[PDB]
Enzyme design. Structure first.
Site, PDB file in Angstrom:
ATOM      1  N   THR H   4       0.718  -1.325   0.008  1.00  0.00           N
ATOM      2  CA  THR H   4      -0.019  -0.006  -0.062  1.00  0.00           C
ATOM      3  C   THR H   4       0.669   1.448   0.141  1.00  0.00           C
ATOM      4  N   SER H   5      -0.119   2.418  -0.206  1.00  0.00           N
ATOM      5  CA  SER H   5       0.154   3.794  -0.115  1.00  0.00           C
ATOM      6  C   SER H   5      -0.977   4.455   0.473  1.00  0.00           C
ATOM      7  CB  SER H   5       0.439   4.498  -1.447  1.00  0.00           C
ATOM      8  OG  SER H   5       1.754   4.221  -2.005  1.00  0.00           O
TER       9      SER H   5
END
EC number: 3.4.25.1
Lengths: 102, 243, 249, 244, 238, 237, 232, 199, 241
Positions: H4-5
């Site tokens: 993720t981001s």
């Protein structure tokens, strides 16, 4: 993995005389090359004229001393303040130590 | 002399006296309730009787917000009511978690009815002295009114009433629907349905009310909420133009 | 903590099991219900009696589906019945379908239900159920069947029978009208006649719940593509179909 | 105060009798009569369905006579519900013995085990005993054809001919009169019916009121066959005996 | 009916009191303490002659330095001995020394009130009492009475069973600060001979002692037989 | 217990109420930023160490409870109270809101009226404190019934007190500062002592106020306790 | 009473737990014992009963920790079960917190342990009364424990049969003994007199009399026999 | 897993959550339109990172808790919600791979942000960044985050910070989602590639 | 979960359930045992015959615990099955750990142990069974006979009987058994045993069964005719007098 053991070093010595006995230990507690305390007592009066020291991994030693001292205390409650013979004390400890055989 | 009177076991007539007594216990509050369906909402009403000036009147309530969409009103002693309330809240939250949608009024009724039935069979546990009137605007079924009792019986309703004057109120309503010829209050606003409801209670009990003589819970698509003494005063102030 | 670990149902000196007798008594007082076996189906039925007209008899399965070819009806304590339906359906799956990949046959599922009913006669801390059931179903190797289950856990198969208020009077009616040639629609008819005696207020499709175990209903499976799955043999009749039928009679 | 309701089902009477056990028998006494008769070449089982209506369904039934394994069957007297619980565990015990030792279970071994169960409800647990009395008809290769009986007390005894349920007092008298050791299976089938014919609280003994079974060879080498008579097979047998 | 661990209005436990009633009906048993040892003796009471009179053990060894005699529903005492024997051997194992007699008794007594409906699985109290006699090096020779009430007392001499008050009274009088072992042996025999229905002889009575020297020994029918005829002769002369 | 009598009530609860009535009086008064608790402690003998048999208990840091009836039952309830208030906090972070807490006791007491092998509580508990949005005073019967209160009292001199309370509510509808409520309560304990005046009695007062105790629950002690005792002695004599 | 006193889980129509009250009777029929204290010490004087002249006298005093111990009257085994419970709490507070258990707090615990037997079914309420003394971080303490769950703190008090006499004598003596600070042997005599006031039939001597004291620099100790001769 | 981001930034009127859209298993992008913004309560949301299976199962169980809580204690604080997440993450450190950011709006507290990293620890913060792609925007975010920002500014700040994370992190990509939380309800935004790349 | 205290004391100091359990033993068919110089014999009454029962398979009163020990009982048959199973197990378990079969006193103790645990455990009633346990310790010739009751009390006996009319036949034996002159032969012993029962049986060898236990796992059950040689002999011996 988490290693539950450790070594605090130290050296202890027991000698028996005709009407006396000594239990000596050094005072230095450690970890690898560091010193943790130049004064951390290792030998203990446990009542009934018994002294003891559990050298090695001071955590397990502390645990063991606490238990035995308390064993004494209960021997007094449970058996009418009878004094704990040194041999009787030695036997008790074998049971403590063997409880944690594994 | 007894024994089949204290535990949940049959008498020779085939009756469980304990359940019958649990029914008595529902009237103990000496409070009456009713519920009716709008064209797209559900309204419940219970009398509010705060006789002691010491009680903080805003904590005396027999209506509960079980779910976001399901409201429940109880006829019977408060401890049992709280006991049933909490349980129904838990059940609706759990049902949500496991099945991915909000528990619908009828299902919760059935669920609770089934627990009340258990107390009916087991000896050690007594049934609760309450009658639970669940209401919602169900997503599949539309406005719902389902009520359970201590026997573990439960059933749907066009409208319904409970308490010491269950009978009086009930026939007032039956009559109206015979005339209107429908299964609901043909009103678009919920405020008017509330007004209808309050009106028909005053008419069946022969008593008039203050703003602190009632509790009103309303169920709408996606929300169930209870009115303040102020939202009620407005209702009353309006039903006073109705003649 | 349930301290009632002893039976609440015990042998009396005369040999009676009190609490069972009493559950049966509780059945006598229940609304009349009945089952009738034909050569190409079984019909089970009862009266949907609601005290208040504000209640919605539609929302009351006095007649319930246990499997797609098995249905059930009762007389006595409705709540005790509603839970046996839930238990029956579940045992129907867990104890049978989840092993053999087929639904249990009528008799065996009846055996399960009856088993649950018996344990209540002997387990500690409970009264038996206060219902008598009529269960109708069709299985591939036994044809159509009908069983009655009592509080005792005892059960038996019938060509036709009734339980409840009209039980005495109704069974008489049925003895006269039953023959091995009856073709379902004829049996439905009789049921509607027999039941007409018991009911005393309104008598129409909204005050009568009726269901049949008969032919297979493809239009009711909900999917197509498996030539070998053919739809449920159980069909509950809609009030609009009862009344049409009554208009004959 | 939970204990006020404990009926104390496993206690002795001042006289050393178990109340609930005795009371259960009294129940059984009222049940449909069932009979077991052992010939040299086979065993017979017969039973009288207590109540009947014209509408009861016979052809698809089994109320009094249930099959435990291929070489063992029982006749029931008392609550049918109770009997099925016990029958089901018995059908399992048979299988466990088989799976374990690869030999069908010896009749006494099963009978004991089941009798040991009923006796459980007699000494501990505070539960009412089972209102069932069984007649076990079986065959194994240690004793051959065997006939046993067990009651709610948890006690079992072995027999040549025996009855349980209603009017036994009378049944035992007739079995004593006409029973003989050399008896052949056909003669035992005959007797089994003549006896019920005299005990029936019914005005006449017809096929729909009955349920019948036989364990013999059949004429298949050293093979043993069990046969739960079908309604038509029972009527065919009643015409021959001289009771159309 | 009404619960097991129920209290009467006088603050007694119905069962413990009804237990003591069963003990009054038991065979007699006397115990006498001395600076030379402790002596226990019992009434066998064989309900028929046919019954082999020595399969009747109402005096048993608990450990080499402790014995005990019983009175009442003796069947109940099997559990208690088993526990006492275990308790004593266990203690030896954990401390490489003998268990003090009090300690041993206090362990038995705990067991006694563990009944009802810690984790007390036992429906009723024991219906038996115990004289417990032994010697430890702290408080020398000792005798204890261990009721089903959980309490115990130390006695210089004590009787339990059928003839206990008559024998206790008789013990009150006859016991002095300095009796020998052999005097005590005789008083047991004498006092048993008074309260037993039967003419005391070596087959309906048994006698035992516990000396620091040789621990607990049960006197064989021969040795006790000589002590009986030692009484008849001691009594004859005045 | 869990047995309805033919009138719909549960006689065992109804009897547990008798026990409570036999109790010393205790009260609660709500004030405009907290609550005050008070109780009469009978001096059985001159041998009781004064100020050493404290009966007002604290729950978490912000809730006080007081009871009349079977003292041990009361503690047993406050023990469950503490276990419950720790649970809630541990998970939800915030110290337990008063109404939530009142129901936690209300569900547990009620639980003890459902089974005939458990006896209900023999106390009527007055408790309350200060939360996220206001002050709350609650009173809880053996029934499991409980409500919010302006004032509350239970025990022998329960009316003597309810009367004095109904006056404070009427003749003070603006509010009633903590300090005033402390003295006012003291007076109510002295007056209520008239019924049960056989023995001499020791006063005990606790209070929980946003301004005076910063939200925490504390025991009115020393000086402020003397004013209260003074204030009361004036309206007796 | 017939129905309502059958078990502990039952309230009488008048709001009373009959079994609880009945278990208090065993105390009232228990041999007397007394407690009293100053600011430096606390003393337990306890009369011992015996079954015979050939019997011993049953100990009415049990130590619980180095700085605390109690006195009993009622069922001995229940004192054992409660004093054993108490021995563990003191011990737990030592082992885990390197802290001496506070006298006040032991009272709260024995109150909670007794209360559960008055609410639960299957279990009887304890049938023993206890006097507890101890020197804790706040000085000398005495408590009166009752099977009902009612523990109370005092300067002095007595329980047992005839205890009423010694209790009244303490109501009087109050202002004197409170101040037997710094004097051990005087506080014992003061307690030893109190005990005489509820004596009646017999007269205290070596075998009867049992005494215990704890205090500022005195670890809790018991004295019996020759050791109590000095006070008769 | 979401790798993720993700980020959550408190501003003047409340708070905004933002996340990429890509979930990878190896180098294959399993789902390029994932909604990493998860709702545990009307105005209390979270962003998930680490094992999907875990983060979902958790979000789901928290929601349930917050729903039951709501039913009986009224509405819960963003704090109470964060607490519930942590109790689960900490009490099961040995079987979880979840790094969750919790963002919500109280009328009294306005915007709040609590980050819950692997350990199960809790840290309340003005803003937080997490996931595979957050290592690259520590520099940027810290330099440009400013307290009490305008909503317009906060959206830019997120849109920029994320665009960068997406640029460098292969494990992050897709569209940029955001959830806005104020007194004025809940707003849902989205920015497509053709837009955020051009910054 | 059912632990109600069924065996409890009453004011007089009795446990009525243990006593009603003996009442059940007095109801049972008589059982007797007598020991000779070198053997032990067991006898057992059996209702009538009966002209319609099957004897080969149906439970016979004497049971084998091990190859050298047997057990006989009066009272509830169903109950005795339970004590026989447990006893037969403890026998083989003893062998398995101690490498030696049980002694008769050891087995006897174990059984009486069970009987007692059922007088002191909750949720259970005592056994309506009393027993005679007889045999020979291993590598031992001296005969052993023991009796156990529902109390859990046990004790050895030179001769004993239990069950219906036991009182009559104990009185008989109390006269007809000299401790100094115990039946030197098997025959001499089996005779006394057949005679002790012939007060209470009301017919000859029809009801009586005898089992003869002799050292080193030597046990045999006399078949009716051999019993009828003692019956034929006893009726003509009494006659002459």
């Amino acid at each position: 993995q988490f290693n539950p053991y450790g070594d605090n070093g130290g050296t202890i010595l027991g000698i028996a005389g005709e009407d006396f006995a000594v239990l000596a230990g050094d005072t230095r507690n450690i970890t690898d090359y560091s010193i943790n305390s130049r004064y951390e007592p290792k030998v203990f009066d446990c009542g009934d004229n018994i002294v003891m020291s559990a050298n090695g991994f001071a955590a397990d030693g502390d645990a063991l001393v606490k238990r035995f001292k308390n064993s004494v205390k209960w021997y007094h409650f449970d058996h009418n303040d009878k004094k704990l013979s040194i041999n009787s004390a030695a036997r008790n400890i074998q049971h403590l130590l063997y409880g944690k055989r594994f | 002399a007894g024994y089949d009177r204290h535990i949940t076991i049959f008498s020779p007539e085939g009756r469980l006296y304990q359940v019958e007594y649990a029914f008595k216990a529902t009237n103990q509050t000496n409070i009456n309730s009713l519920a009716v369906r709008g064209k797209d909402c559900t309204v419940v009403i219970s009398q509010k009787k705060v006789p002691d000036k010491l009680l903080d009147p805003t904590t005396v309530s027999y209506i509960f917000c079980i779910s976001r969409t399901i409201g429940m009103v109880v006829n019977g002693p408060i401890p049992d009511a709280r006991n049933a309330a909490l349980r129904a809240k838990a059940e609706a939250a759990e049902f949500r978690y496991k099945y991915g949608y909000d528990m619908p009024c009828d299902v919760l009724a059935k669920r609770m009815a089934n627990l009340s039935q258990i107390y009916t069979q087991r000896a050690y546990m007594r049934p609760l002295g309450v009658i639970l009137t669940f209401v919602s605007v169900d997503e599949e079924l539309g406005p719902s009114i389902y009520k359970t009792d201590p026997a573990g019986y439960y059933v749907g309703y066009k409208a319904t009433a409970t308490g010491p004057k269950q009978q009086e109120i009930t026939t007032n309503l039956e009559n109206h629907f015979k005339k209107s010829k429908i299964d609901h209050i043909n009103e678009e606003s919920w405020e008017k349905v509330v007004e209808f409801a309050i009106t028909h209670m005053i008419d069946a009990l022969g008593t008039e009310f203050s703003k602190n003589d009632l509790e009103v819970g309303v169920a709408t698509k996606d929300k169930f909420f209870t009115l303040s003494a102020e939202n009620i005063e407005e209702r009353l102030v309006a039903i006073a133009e109705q003649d | 903590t349930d301290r009632y670990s002893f039976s609440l149902t015990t042998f009396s000196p005369s040999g009676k099991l009190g609490q069972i007798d009493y559950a049966l008594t509780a059945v006598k007082q229940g609304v009349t219900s009945l089952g009738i076996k034909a050569t190409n189906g079984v019909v089970i039925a009862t009266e949907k009696k609601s005290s208040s007209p504000l209640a919605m008899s539609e929302t009351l399965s006095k007649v319930s589906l246990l499997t797609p070819d098995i249905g059930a009806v009762y007389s006595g304590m409705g709540p005790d019945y509603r839970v046996l339906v839930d238990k029956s359906r579940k045992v129907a799956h867990t104890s049978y379908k989840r092993i053999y990949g087929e639904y249990p046959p009528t008799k065996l599922l009846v055996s399960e239900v009856a088993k649950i009913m018996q344990e209540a006669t002997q387990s500690g801390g409970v009264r038996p159920f206060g219902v008598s059931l009529l269960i109708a179903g069709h299985d591939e190797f036994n044809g159509f069947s009908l069983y009655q289950v009592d509080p005792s856990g005892s059960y038996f198969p019938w060509k036709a029978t009734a339980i409840g208020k009209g039980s005495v009077a109704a069974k008489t009616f049925l003895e006269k009208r039953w023959n091995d040639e009856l073709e379902l629609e004829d049996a439905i008819h009789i049921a509607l006649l027999t039941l007409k005696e018991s009911v005393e207020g309104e008598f129409n499709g909204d005050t009568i719940e009726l269901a049949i175990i008969g032919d297979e209903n493809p239009d009711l499976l909900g999917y197509t593509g498996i030539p070998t799955d053919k739809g449920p043999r159980f069909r509950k009749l809609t009030s609009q179909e009862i009344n049409d039928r009554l208009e004959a009679l | 105060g939970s204990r006020r309701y404990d009926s104390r089902t496993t206690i002795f009477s001042p006289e050393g009798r178990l109340y609930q056990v005795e009371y259960a028998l009294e129940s059984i006494s009222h049940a449909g009569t069932a009979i077991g008769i052992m010939a040299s070449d086979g065993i017979v089982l017969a039973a009288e369905r207590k109540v009947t209506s014209t509408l009861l369904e016979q052809d698809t039934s089994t109320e009094k006579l249930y099959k435990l394994n291929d070489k063992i069957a029982v006749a029931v007297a008392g609550l049918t519900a109770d009997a099925e619980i016990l029958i089901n565990t018995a059908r399992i015990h048979a299988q466990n013995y088989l799976k374990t030792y690869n030999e069908d279970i010896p009749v006494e071994i099963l009978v004991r085990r089941l009798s040991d169960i009923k006796q459980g409800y007699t000494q501990h647990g505070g539960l009412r005993p089972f209102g069932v009395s069984f007649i076990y008809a079986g065959y194994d290769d240690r004793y051959g054809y065997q006939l046993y009986t067990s009651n709610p007390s948890g006690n079992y005894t072995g027999w040549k001919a025996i009855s349980v349920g209603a009017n036994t007092s009378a049944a035992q008298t007739l079995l004593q009169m006409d029973y003989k050791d050399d008896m052949k299976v056909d003669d035992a089938i005959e007797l089994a019916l003549k006896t019920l014919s005299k005990t029936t609280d019914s005005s006449a003994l017809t096929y729909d009121r009955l349920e019948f079974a036989t364990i013999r060879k059949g004429a298949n080498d050293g093979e043993v066959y069990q046969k739960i008579f079908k309604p038509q097979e029972i009527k065919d047998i009643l015409v021959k005996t001289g009771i159309t | 009916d009404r619960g097991v661990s129920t209290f009467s209005p006088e603050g007694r436990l119905f069962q413990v009191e009804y237990s003591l009633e069963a003990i009054k009906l038991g065979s007699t048993a006397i115990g006498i303490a001395t600076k030379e040892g402790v002596v226990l003796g019992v009434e066998k009471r064989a309900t028929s002659p046919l019954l082999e009179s020595d399969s009747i053990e109402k005096i048993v060894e608990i450990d080499r330095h402790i014995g005990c005699a019983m009175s009442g529903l003796t069947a109940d005492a099997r559990s208690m001995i088993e526990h006492a024997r275990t308790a004593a051997v266990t203690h030896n194992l954990y401390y490489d020394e003998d268990i003090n007699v009090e300690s041993l008794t206090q362990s038995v007594c705990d067991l006694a009130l563990r009944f009802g409906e810690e984790e007390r699985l036992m429906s009723r109290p024991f219906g038996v009492a115990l004289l417990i006699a032994g010697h430890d090096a702290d408080d020398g020779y000792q005798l204890f009475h261990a009721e089903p009430s959980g309490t115990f007392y130390r006695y210089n001499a004590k009787a339990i069973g059928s003839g206990s008050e008559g024998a206790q009274a008789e013990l009150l009088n006859e016991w002095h600060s300095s009796l020998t072992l052999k005097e005590a042996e005789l008083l047991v025999l004498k006092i048993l001979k008074q309260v037993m229905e039967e003419k005391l002889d070596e087959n309906n009575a048994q006698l035992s002692c516990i000396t620091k020297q040789d621990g607990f020994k049960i006197y064989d029918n021969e040795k006790t037989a000589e002590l009986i005829k030692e009484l008849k002769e001691k009594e004859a002369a005045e | 217990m869990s047995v309805f009598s033919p009138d719909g009530r549960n006689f065992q609860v109804e009897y547990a109420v008798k026990a409570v009535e036999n109790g010393t009086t205790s009260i609660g008064i709500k004030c405009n930023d907290g609550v005050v608790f008070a109780v009469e402690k009978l001096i059985t003998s001159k041998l009781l160490v004064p100020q050493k048999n404290v009966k007002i208990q604290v729950v978490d840091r912000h809730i006080g409870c007081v009871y009349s009836g079977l003292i041990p039952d009361g503690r047993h309830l406050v023990n469950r109270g503490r276990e419950e208030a720790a649970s809630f906090k541990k998970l939800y972070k915030t110290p337990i809101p008063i109404p939530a807490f009142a129901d936690r006791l209300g569900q547990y007491v009620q639980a003890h009226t459902l089974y005939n092998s458990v006896r209900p509580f023999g106390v009527s508990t007055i408790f309350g404190g200060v939360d996220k949005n206001g002050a709350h005073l609650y009173m809880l019967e053996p029934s499991g019934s409980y409500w919010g209160y302006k004032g509350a009292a239970t025990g022998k001199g329960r009316q003597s007190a309810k009367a004095e309370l109904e006056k404070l509510v009427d003749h003070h509808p603006e509010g009633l500062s903590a300090r005033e409520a402390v003295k006012q309560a003291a007076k109510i304990i002295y007056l209520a002592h008239e019924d049960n005046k056989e023995k001499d009695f020791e006063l005990e007062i606790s209070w929980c106020s946003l301004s005076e105790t910063n939200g925490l629950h504390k025991f009115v002690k020393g000086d402020l306790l003397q004013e209260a005792i003074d204030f009361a002695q004036k309206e007796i004599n | 009473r017939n129905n309502y006193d059958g078990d502990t889980v039952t309230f009488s129509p008048t709001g009373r737990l009959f079994q609880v009250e009945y278990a208090l009777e065993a105390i009232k029929q228990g041999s007397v014992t007394v407690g009293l204290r100053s600011n430096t010490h606390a003393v337990l004087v306890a009369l011992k009963r015996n079954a015979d002249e050939l019997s011993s006298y049953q100990k009415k005093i049990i130590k619980c920790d180095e700085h605390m111990g109690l006195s009993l009257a009622g069922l001995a085994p229940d004192a054992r079960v409660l004093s054993n419970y108490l021995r563990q709490q003191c011990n737990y507070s030592s082992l885990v917190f390197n802290r001496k258990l506070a006298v006040e707090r032991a009272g709260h615990l024995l109150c909670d342990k007794a209360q559960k037997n008055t609410q639960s079914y299957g279990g009887r309420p304890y049938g023993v009364g206890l006097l507890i003394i101890g020197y804790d971080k706040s000085g000398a303490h005495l408590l009166e424990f009752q099977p009902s769950g009612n523990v109370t703190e005092l300067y002095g008090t007595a329980i047992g049969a005839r205890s009423q006499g010694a209790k009244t004598y303490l109501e009087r003596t109050l202002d004197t003994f409170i101040k037997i600070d710094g004097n051990p042997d005087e506080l014992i005599k003061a307690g030893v007199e109190a005990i005489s006031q509820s004596l009646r039939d017999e007269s205290l001597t070596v075998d009867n009399l049992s005494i215990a004291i704890v205090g500022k620099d005195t670890p809790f100790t018991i004295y019996d026999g020759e050791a109590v001769a000095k006070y008769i | 897993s979401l790798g993720t981001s993700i980020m959550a930034v408190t501003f003047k009127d409340g708070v905004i959550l933002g996340a990429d859209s890509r979930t990878t298993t190896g180098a294959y992008i399993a789902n390029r339109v994932t909604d990493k913004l998860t709702r545990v309560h009307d105005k209390i949301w979270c962003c998930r990172s680490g094992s999907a299976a875990d983060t979902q199962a958790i979000a789901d169980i928290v929601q349930y808790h917050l729903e039951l809580y709501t039913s009986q204690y009224g509405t819960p604080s963003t704090e109470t919600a964060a607490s519930v997440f942590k109790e689960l993450c900490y009490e099961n450190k040995d079987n979880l791979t979840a790094g969750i950011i919790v963002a919500g709006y109280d009328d009294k507290n306005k915007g709040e942000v609590y980050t819950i990293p692997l350990g199960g620890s809790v840290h309340k913060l003005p803003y937080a960044i997490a996931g595979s792609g957050s290592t690259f925007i520590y520099g940027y975010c810290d330099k440009n985050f400013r307290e009490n920002m305008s909503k317009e500014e906060t959206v830019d700040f997120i849109k920029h910070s994320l665009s960068q994370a997406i640029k460098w992190d292969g494990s992050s990509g897709g569209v940029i989602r955001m959830v806005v939380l104020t007194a004025a309800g809940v707003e849902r935004l989205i920015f497509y590639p053709d837009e955020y790349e051009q910054l | 979960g059912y632990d109600r205290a069924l065996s409890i004391f009453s004011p007089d100091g009795h446990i009525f359930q243990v006593e009603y359990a003996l009442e059940a033993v007095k109801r049972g068919t008589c059982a007797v045992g007598v020991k000779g110089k070198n053997c032990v014999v067991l006898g057992c009454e059996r209702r009538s015959t009966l002209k319609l029962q099957d004897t080969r398979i149906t439970p016979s009163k004497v049971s084998k615990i091990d190859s050298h020990v047997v057990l006989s009982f009066s009272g509830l048959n169903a109950d005795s099955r339970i004590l026989i199973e447990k006893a037969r197990v403890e026998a083989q378990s003893h062998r398995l750990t101690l490498e030696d079969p049980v002694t008769v006193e050891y087995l006897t103790r174990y059984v009486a142990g069970v009987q007692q645990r059922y007088t002191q455990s909750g949720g259970v009633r005592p056994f309506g069974v009393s027993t005679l346990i007889a045999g020979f310790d291993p590598r031992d010739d001296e005969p052993k006979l023991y009796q156990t009751e529902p109390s859990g009390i046990y004790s050895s006996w030179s001769a004993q009987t239990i069950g219906r009319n036991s009182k009559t036949v104990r009185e008989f034996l109390e006269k007809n058994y000299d401790r100094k002159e115990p039946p030197a032969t098997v025959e001499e012993c089996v005779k006394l045993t057949v005679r002790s029962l012939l007060e209470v049986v009301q017919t000859g060898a029809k009801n009586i069964e005898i089992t003869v236990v002799k050292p080193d796992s030597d046990i045999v059950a006399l078949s009716s005719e051999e019993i009828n040689q003692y019956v034929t002999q006893i009726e003509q011996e009494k006659q002459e007098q």
